Design an enzyme around this catalytic site. Structure first.
Site, PDB file in Angstrom:
ATOM      1  N   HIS A   1       1.063  -1.176  -0.172  1.00 61.02           N
ATOM      2  CA  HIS A   1       0.162  -0.147   0.022  1.00 61.02           C
ATOM      3  C   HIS A   1       0.783   1.158  -0.039  1.00 61.02           C
ATOM      4  O   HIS A   1       0.733   2.068   0.735  1.00 61.02           O
ATOM      5  CB  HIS A   1      -1.171   0.097   1.180  1.00 61.02           C
ATOM      6  CG  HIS A   1      -2.156  -0.835   0.929  1.00 61.02           C
ATOM      7  ND1 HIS A   1      -2.248  -1.964   1.540  1.00 61.02           N
ATOM      8  CD2 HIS A   1      -3.193  -0.455   0.055  1.00 61.02           C
ATOM      9  CE1 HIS A   1      -3.310  -2.682   1.118  1.00 61.02           C
ATOM     10  NE2 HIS A   1      -4.078  -1.879   0.395  1.00 61.02           N
TER      11      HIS A   1
ATOM     12  N   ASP B   1      -7.972  -0.517  -8.517  1.00 59.76           N
ATOM     13  CA  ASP B   1      -7.475  -0.881  -7.145  1.00 59.76           C
ATOM     14  C   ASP B   1      -7.019  -2.311  -7.190  1.00 59.76           C
ATOM     15  O   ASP B   1      -5.881  -2.613  -6.418  1.00 59.76           O
ATOM     16  CB  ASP B   1      -8.493  -0.726  -6.035  1.00 59.76           C
ATOM     17  CG  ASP B   1      -7.620  -0.504  -4.646  1.00 59.76           C
ATOM     18  OD1 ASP B   1      -6.401  -0.197  -4.660  1.00 59.76           O
ATOM     19  OD2 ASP B   1      -8.509  -0.723  -3.573  1.00 59.76           O
TER      20      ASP B   1
HETATM   21  C1  LIG Z   1      -3.991 -10.293  -5.558  1.00 56.75           C
HETATM   22  C2  LIG Z   1      -4.768  -9.553  -4.625  1.00 56.75           C
HETATM   23  C3  LIG Z   1      -5.466  -8.265  -4.980  1.00 56.75           C
HETATM   24  C4  LIG Z   1      -5.178  -7.605  -5.872  1.00 56.75           C
HETATM   25  F1  LIG Z   1      -6.011  -7.645  -6.750  1.00 56.75           F
HETATM   26  F2  LIG Z   1      -5.160  -6.014  -5.537  1.00 56.75           F
HETATM   27  F3  LIG Z   1      -4.006  -7.727  -6.326  1.00 56.75           F
HETATM   28  N1  LIG Z   1      -6.211  -8.062  -3.666  1.00 56.75           N
HETATM   29  C5  LIG Z   1      -6.100  -9.152  -2.960  1.00 56.75           C
HETATM   30  C6  LIG Z   1      -6.766  -9.170  -1.830  1.00 56.75           C
HETATM   31  C7  LIG Z   1      -6.498 -10.589  -1.098  1.00 56.75           C
HETATM   32  C8  LIG Z   1      -5.872 -11.590  -1.694  1.00 56.75           C
HETATM   33  C9  LIG Z   1      -5.594 -12.900  -1.154  1.00 56.75           C
HETATM   34  C10 LIG Z   1      -6.642 -13.790  -1.361  1.00 56.75           C
HETATM   35  C11 LIG Z   1      -6.932 -14.889  -0.353  1.00 56.75           C
HETATM   36  N2  LIG Z   1      -5.839 -15.537   0.148  1.00 56.75           N
HETATM   37  C12 LIG Z   1      -6.505 -16.368   1.053  1.00 56.75           C
HETATM   38  N3  LIG Z   1      -5.651 -17.288   1.852  1.00 56.75           N
HETATM   39  C13 LIG Z   1      -5.874 -18.219   2.616  1.00 56.75           C
HETATM   40  C14 LIG Z   1      -4.727 -19.221   2.835  1.00 56.75           C
HETATM   41  C15 LIG Z   1      -3.754 -18.867   2.125  1.00 56.75           C
HETATM   42  C16 LIG Z   1      -4.237 -17.973   1.046  1.00 56.75           C
HETATM   43  N4  LIG Z   1      -7.703 -16.551   1.056  1.00 56.75           N
HETATM   44  N5  LIG Z   1      -7.841 -15.630   0.211  1.00 56.75           N
HETATM   45  C17 LIG Z   1      -9.459 -15.102  -0.098  1.00 56.75           C
HETATM   46  N6  LIG Z   1      -5.086 -11.312  -2.722  1.00 56.75           N
HETATM   47  N7  LIG Z   1      -5.311 -10.164  -3.537  1.00 56.75           N
HETATM   48 MG   LIG Z   2      -7.410   1.147   0.110  1.00 55.60          MG
HETATM   49 ZN   LIG Z   3      -5.519   0.756  -2.981  1.00 57.13          ZN
END
Ligand SMILES: Cc1c(C(F)(F)F)nc2ccc(CCc3nc(N4CCCC4)nn3C)nn12
Ligand SMILES: [Mg+2]
Ligand SMILES: [Zn+2]
Length: 313
Positions: A68, A217
């Site tokens: 961030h 985003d």
């Molecule tokens: C690539 C990305 C972006 C962006 F678009 F901004 F790039 N924004 C996010 C937000 C969350 C995540 C992690 C997703 C996730 N990881 C898990 N974990 C459970 C156990 C190990 C993994 N559960 N969940 C739902 N990735 N993400």
């Molecule tokens: Mg934000």
């Molecule tokens: Zn952001």
């Protein structure tokens, strides 16, 4: 007045594409952002002295956190630049001005912690703002920097235009609270499919800009696989630090944030692509057809994570 910004040929060409990476040289991100305001809005939208001074004040107020950070801000602004340029006739003189600023400012003074962590820690900001805690902090920091002497990039605007543009930035920045996205997309889905979606309804534009803000985003899933793979490292590095802090207050963190659950990452990426990104970019392509490349790119990256699960990489 007659002082263009120009980029090396490869950047001049690649910057127009959705999947563009702004690269590792911090020192050119300001030049890049200006370059986008100038092609996106006009060389006359902002006084160059004031804009530069605003850009550098914004940079100073992003923090050295893994994800961030100032690079996220300019990344999110470039995705928006690409959407604006592939839909040029659809957006007001004011909307073009406000939305690039909204993206640059949308994570001002982020500490690398979710709204939930501020609430469970009982951070003063959770008392000041009960919902969309950090996002109201972000808008707040934007207005602070807009009031610093010599930073009013909007000084030329009428009283009402200035209020309209600040009100676009406010809703824009609020919309980046992903808790609001799920409902926002669902309504836009229904509206599109019943043919009730009307871009002259100001409450419909608000939702459409909202979805665009989620799309920008999340744009780190719409990049070439090696950029997407490496950004996920930064994202997980903040989440696992928040995990550690949660354990510190005596709370099992959600698995997303448990560094002990490193191994399930590709499975968690799948969930996220299927539950969040794919839907986001689907609804957005339906509403704004020239944004299809974000959807195509997102799909390719979903497919790359499927390959990781199957030990094909
Ligand atoms: C690539 C990305 C972006 C962006 F678009 F901004 F790039 N924004 C996010 C937000 C969350 C995540 C992690 C997703 C996730 N990881 C898990 N974990 C459970 C156990 C190990 C993994 N559960 N969940 C739902 N990735 N993400
Ligand atoms: Mg934000
Ligand atoms: Zn952001």
């Amino acid at each position: 007045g007659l002082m263009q910004f120009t980029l090396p040929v490869r950047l001049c060409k690649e910057i127009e594409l959705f999947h563009f990476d702004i690269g590792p040289f911090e020192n050119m991100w300001p030049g890049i952002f200006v370059y986008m305001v100038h092609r996106s809005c006009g060389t006359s939208c902002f006084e160059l002295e004031k804009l530069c001074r605003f850009i550098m004040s914004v940079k100073k107020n992003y923090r050295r956190v893994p994800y961030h950070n100032w690079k996220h801000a300019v990344t999110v602004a470039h995705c928006m630049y690409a959407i604006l340029q592939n839909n040029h006739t659809l957006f007001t003189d004011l909307e073009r001005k406000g939305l690039l600023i909204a993206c640059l400012c949308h994570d001002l003074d982020h500490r690398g912690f979710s709204n939930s962590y501020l609430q469970k820690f009982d951070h003063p900001l959770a008392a000041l703002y009960s919902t969309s805690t950090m996002e109201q902090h972000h808008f707040s920091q934007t207005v602070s920097i807009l009031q610093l002497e010599g930073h009013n990039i909007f000084s030329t605007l009428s009283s009402s235009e200035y209020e309209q543009v600040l009100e676009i930035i406010r809703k824009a920045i609020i919309a980046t609270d992903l808790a609001l996205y799920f409902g926002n997309r669902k309504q836009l889905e229904e509206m599109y499919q019943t043919g009730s979606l009307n871009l002259n309804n100001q409450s419909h534009r608000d939702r459409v800009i909202g979805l665009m803000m989620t799309a920008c985003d999340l744009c780190s899933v719409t990049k070439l696989w090696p950029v997407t793979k490496l950004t996920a490292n930064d994202i997980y590095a903040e989440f696992w630090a928040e995990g550690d802090e949660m354990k510190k207050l005596g709370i099992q963190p959600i698995p997303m944030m448990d560094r002990d659950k490193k191994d399930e990452v590709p499975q968690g990426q799948l969930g996220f692509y299927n539950a969040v990104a794919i839907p986001c970019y689907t609804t957005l392509t339906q509403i704004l057809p020239p944004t299809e490349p974000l959807l195509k790119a997102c799909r390719d990256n979903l497919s790359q994570w499927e390959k990781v699960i199957r030990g094909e990489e």
